[PDB]
Amino acid sequence: SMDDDQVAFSFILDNIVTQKMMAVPDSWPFHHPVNKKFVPDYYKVIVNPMDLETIRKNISKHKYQSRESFLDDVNLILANSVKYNGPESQYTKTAQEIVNVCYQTLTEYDEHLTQLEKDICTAKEAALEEAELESLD
Numbered sequence: 001s002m003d004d005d006q007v008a009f010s011f012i013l014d015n016i017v018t019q020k021m022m023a024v025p026d027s028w029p030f031h032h033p034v035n036k037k038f039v040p041d042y043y044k045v046i047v048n049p050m051d052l053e054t055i056r057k058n059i060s061k062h063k064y065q066s067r068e069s070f071l072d073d074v075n076l077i078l079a080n081s082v083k084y085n086g087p088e089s090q091y092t093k094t095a096q097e098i099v100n101v102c103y104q105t106l107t108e109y110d111e112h113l114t115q116l117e118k119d120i121c122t123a124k125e126a127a128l129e130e131a132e133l134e135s136l137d
């Protein structure tokens with residue numbers, strides 16, 4: 001089923017987030033959105049904020065249909081640390097470790113993830129095609 005494949009894909013991504021990325025030592029700065037009351041200028045500097053909680057929310061909404069779209073937001077966490085904290089900040093070194101363990105685990109699950117990504121794409125194109133043939137009935 002398309003629902004089954006979306007569920008499996010999202011569960012794999014979520015397990016990467018909770019079991020690997022959130023387990024990086026000292027990764028607390030990236031676990032939740034920055035609180036504007038604690039860091040008032042953060043959102044003056046960071047136009048496209050991202051964090052691991054928001055990624056999990058997106059996973060739960062089946063936002064990610066590909067490894068690439070997932071990694072777009074994962075890399076946003078690192079890029080926002082580079083911008084706000086600097087490329088040599090310990091915050092950025094931590095974000096880099098989060099990104100690297102993400103890559104390592106996606107590599108581990110690449111065969112299954114690639115198959116799910118293709119089958120989701122195929123099913124989606126078929127459902128789109130069928131919806132359109134039906135609309136003209």
Ligand SMILES: C[C@@H]1COCCN1c1cc(C2([S@](C)(=N)=O)CC2)nc(-c2cccc3[nH]ncc23)n1
Pocket residue numbers: 028029030031032033034035036038039042081084085091
């Ligand atoms: C801005 C820094 C560096 O970039 C990554 C983000 N990071 C953060 C992130 C967070 C959050 S929170 C608690 N939900 O706002 C998400 C955990 N809090 C802080 C913070 C809060 C209050 C006083 C502070 N002094 N120093 C840092 C700090 N900093």
